[PDB]
Design a protein around this ligand. Sequence first.
Ligand code: FES
Ligand code: K
Ligand code: K
Ligand code: K
Ligand code: K
Ligand code: K
Ligand code: K
Ligand code: K
Ligand code: MG
Ligand code: MG
Ligand code: MG
Ligand code: MG
Ligand code: MG
Ligand code: MG
Ligand code: MG
Ligand code: MG
Ligand code: MG
Ligand code: MG
Ligand code: MG
Ligand code: MG
Ligand code: MG
Ligand code: MG
Ligand code: MG
Ligand code: MG
Ligand code: MG
Ligand code: MG
Ligand code: MG
Ligand code: MG
Ligand code: MG
Ligand code: MG
Ligand code: MG
Ligand code: MG
Ligand code: MG
Ligand code: MG
Ligand code: MG
Lengths: 108, 164
Amino acid sequence: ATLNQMHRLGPPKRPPRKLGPTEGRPQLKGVVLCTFTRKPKKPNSANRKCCRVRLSTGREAVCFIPGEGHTLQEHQIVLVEGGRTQDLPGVKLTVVRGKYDCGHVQKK
Amino acid sequence: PMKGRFPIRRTLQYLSQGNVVFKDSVKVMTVNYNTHGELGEGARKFVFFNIPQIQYKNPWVQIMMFKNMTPSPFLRFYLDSGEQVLVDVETKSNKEIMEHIRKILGKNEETLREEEEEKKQLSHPANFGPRKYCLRECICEVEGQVPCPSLVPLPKEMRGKYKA
RNA sequence: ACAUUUAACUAAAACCCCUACGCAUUUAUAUAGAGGAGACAAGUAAGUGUACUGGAAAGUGCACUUGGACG
RNA sequence: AUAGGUUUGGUCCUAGCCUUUCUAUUAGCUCUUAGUAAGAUUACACAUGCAAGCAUCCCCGUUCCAGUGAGUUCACCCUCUAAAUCACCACGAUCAAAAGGGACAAGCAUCAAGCACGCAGCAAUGCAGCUCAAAACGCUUAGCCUAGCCACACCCCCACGGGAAACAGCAGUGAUUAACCUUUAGCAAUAAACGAAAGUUUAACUAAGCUAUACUAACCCCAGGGUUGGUCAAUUUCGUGCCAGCCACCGCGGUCACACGAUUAACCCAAGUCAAUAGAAGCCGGCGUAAAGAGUGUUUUAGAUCACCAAUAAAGCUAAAACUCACCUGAGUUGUAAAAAACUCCAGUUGACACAAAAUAGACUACGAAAGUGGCUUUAACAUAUCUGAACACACAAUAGCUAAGACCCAAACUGGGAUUAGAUACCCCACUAUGCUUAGCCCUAAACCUCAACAGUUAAAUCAACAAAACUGCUCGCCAGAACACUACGAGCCACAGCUUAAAACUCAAA
Ligand code: FES
Ligand SMILES: [K+]
Ligand SMILES: [K+]
Ligand SMILES: [K+]
Ligand SMILES: [K+]
Ligand SMILES: [K+]
Ligand SMILES: [K+]
Ligand SMILES: [K+]
Ligand SMILES: [Mg+2]
Ligand SMILES: [Mg+2]
Ligand SMILES: [Mg+2]
Ligand SMILES: [Mg+2]
Ligand SMILES: [Mg+2]
Ligand SMILES: [Mg+2]
Ligand SMILES: [Mg+2]
Ligand SMILES: [Mg+2]
Ligand SMILES: [Mg+2]
Ligand SMILES: [Mg+2]
Ligand SMILES: [Mg+2]
Ligand SMILES: [Mg+2]
Ligand SMILES: [Mg+2]
Ligand SMILES: [Mg+2]
Ligand SMILES: [Mg+2]
Ligand SMILES: [Mg+2]
Ligand SMILES: [Mg+2]
Ligand SMILES: [Mg+2]
Ligand SMILES: [Mg+2]
Ligand SMILES: [Mg+2]
Ligand SMILES: [Mg+2]
Ligand SMILES: [Mg+2]
Ligand SMILES: [Mg+2]
Ligand SMILES: [Mg+2]
Ligand SMILES: [Mg+2]
Ligand SMILES: [Mg+2]
Ligand SMILES: [Mg+2]
């Protein structure tokens, strides 16, 4: 572009940053509605432990439960953070271990 | 690289290199010049190189250009009193035009140094305040004075917790 | 729409208006129903535009291109 | 950025995503001392206690301080000039309202027109004007330009009035959020209010309390967190076997797993560590083939320095070849790899005979802005002695298509018949429509391409990623910033109504 065109257009106008599943918040509180498992997309194979949660904002979302063995049931309270599960498409929230009902992974 | 011929013109150093600071009487500067004709060559250069500097040093003076309206180039300055100053610039180089306008309507170096000294007084070195305005924030930064408790804890006798 | 009284051998008292807003107007939410995109999951050269046929897959007509072939 | 990882069988280029750095909040785990700084998520609702007195009565103050960030170009400069302080006799300084002039945040032009937004006159009244693609009008977002400033003080902008009964003062509480400080003391200092003054009052403030949020300094015994496949510093044994599980990106896990779990050892930081979130840091680069020169030309406000042959409109005209008609002659003609259908008012010679198309020339490379233009004659006729200049303004735009009428040789979507085929809703043969033609209107799309934007200039440099078409420079307009969603949705405009122009977002991916 020429100098006249650059002056006409002005400084670049950067689009606003997209808000993620947590909507720009570190963590979110949620109530577990149901627990289930999902299968990875296929370079891999497993049964990933997941749960649907109604967040404090009212939106329902699918979350992954990290670690070996969880004791989450319906109506329980959990704290969910960001971070995509690379194997599960559409799962962009992760349950925080050791907060509210979701306890730490049992040793061994 | 930077766009356009002579990109140095679009740097703050070049813009600040000008030496023409108009007196407060000047309000408007019209520049009538011709795009073609050897006798106007300097005037064209005067438009190309020195008008940005003049405007940079004189932000409130209205500078306006006119092209191929008269057979010869000339400058006209309008003063606050209503007087008009006509400067014929045909056959003159751009440096000559700068020197002429500086001589006839430019503040001399004495006035500029006086203004700088006046600006100096506003920033009193003894005043204490934010670094944006003062050299030092607190007297505790002065050696020999009681230092800040943030860096050196005060003796227990000087603290209210152990005076109460 | 609406209006100047008392008082005055020192000087004072008195003063107060009625109308709007709705079957108007703006945007948004919920809801019947309909439809998309994504994820998962599994011989007639090639095209562009346009038109018809066909339930589709595709075929054909007209003009244009080589980003094909012609030892 | 001193950069690095990641597309491919491989190389180069382009391009996104991520890594390494520094902050703040929150979460997990852990946490010794001292000093200092800082300290609800919520303009939601608030129990309780304080936060404004002074003073010989009048007045003065409670319009300040303190709080919050809901709304939002009232903050800044100049002119003029109130109130206030001091001169107080004013001359005037200081300070600073109202009024006038100027300046002043971000995103969206799919918000493009606003609809009275001006001027002149003493008025009467007259003129029809004013703003706007250099962004008016409009919607959305946000306290700001921080010695501080602006705005608000429960709501109806305001507060006569109404809803109704107010902590966005300090301490504190309920609800809510990922977000969580004591219902301390004193007016000893400074500041403010009052007083003539000694002085009095103050949840301003000062001195304390709580909190790893940060900085500084320590520590007599006292260390935790994360990581160890590459980017990127650092794994020994086992357990498990595409399961359990792990990853910021690339990826690992199928019996020898440095990538999962335990364990050993090691690496980084350290009273911290670092998981999540949000910031800090960006177009002077490009447009033949990667995104981008959007079919063609003109001009406006502006910017720049480069100041005869094949055009197109009219009118006329016709040399071949068709079709149709007539005589004469023959019984077959057509169809093809081969056949069947079809015709037999068929076929051959001769003669007459278009509103269709324009061999050879043309092995030419011309005219026109492009689209296009190639039979003959004639009349009009091919802008501009600077250049650039529009998706929308003004004009045009192959083929196809839609309205009206007309012409109809040939060709031919479609539609029938014949044949083939497992089937043929195609290919082959026959017939025949819309359409190709003229007239008057529309429609406005193409691989509308030399896939090279217009003007001016250079052949010197390493010519130069590659290929295409040798490499560049100046200047201007247009356009482009990962893929797909998407020649799409919505909005707007249109003689278009299954249409054209402009043209997104959500979800998804690490590529394309
Ligand atoms: S800043 Fe001066 S004593 Fe702290
Ligand atoms: K695998
Ligand atoms: K008083
Ligand atoms: K605010
Ligand atoms: K208000
Ligand atoms: K005091
Ligand atoms: K093993
Ligand atoms: K072409
Ligand atoms: Mg076609
Ligand atoms: Mg890269
Ligand atoms: Mg590879
Ligand atoms: Mg922590
Ligand atoms: Mg006064
Ligand atoms: Mg004012
Ligand atoms: Mg525009
Ligand atoms: Mg829209
Ligand atoms: Mg706000
Ligand atoms: Mg309140
Ligand atoms: Mg109010
Ligand atoms: Mg409070
Ligand atoms: Mg906090
Ligand atoms: Mg008290
Ligand atoms: Mg304190
Ligand atoms: Mg391991
Ligand atoms: Mg392209
Ligand atoms: Mg082109
Ligand atoms: Mg032009
Ligand atoms: Mg435009
Ligand atoms: Mg057309
Ligand atoms: Mg037609
Ligand atoms: Mg063409
Ligand atoms: Mg152009
Ligand atoms: Mg253009
Ligand atoms: Mg894209
Ligand atoms: Mg469309």
